Subunit: 110 residues, 2 copies
């Protein structure tokens, strides 16, 4: 994508709720798919910071975290997203378990 | 958990839909939390094989995949679960993107 300038300019301009959120996500993804994982991380962190309730941005941040090799943090985040937003009866039955294990994946009982 | 025998015996006995699914998940988690990731993987693979529509089991398989260091496969699976089951408007707007990037996370454009 030659889309970085598009999204840059778009952001460098009055922009709000959906509108701006989507340009951060857009830019982030473009950077990530360009292989510019650090640049992607900066942009997407900024989006999550500004639109903490925008789940798609968290999903994309997770994808970056993967590419950067921050596996634990990425899996944590995807599990938290699943727990907080899943339709599925079975997942909601285990919601508390999922949320609990999410920041403790490396832990084990004796 | 001293729960392995509980779940073993339970499974080694007539058992169906919810009933059995939950014992596989149960056993798997117990094994995983015990640090017996290979044992956890076997059990949970079996559950996903038998109850392919049971999303919780896929989440737990993902957690194991993480512990085994099969990060790509685990993140793929969590992204597929999010894409297939999320309430959130924003995530459903990007559903196709998420599903697309899920088995291609290491790829980049030139």
């Amino acid at each position: 994508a030659q889309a970085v300038p598009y999204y840059e300019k778009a952001i460098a301009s009055g922009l709000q709720g959906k509108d701006l959120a989507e340009c951060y996500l857009g830019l982030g993804s473009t950077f990530r798919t360009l292989g510019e994982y650090r640049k992607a991380e900066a942009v997407l962190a900024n989006g999550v910071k500004q639109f903490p309730n925008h789940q798609a941005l968290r999903v994309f941040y997770a994808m970056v975290l993967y590419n950067l090799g921050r596996y634990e943090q990425g899996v944590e985040l995807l599990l938290k997203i699943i727990a907080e937003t899943s339709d599925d009866e079975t997942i909601q039955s285990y919601k508390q378990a999922i949320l609990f294990y999410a920041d403790k994946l490396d832990e084990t009982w004796k």
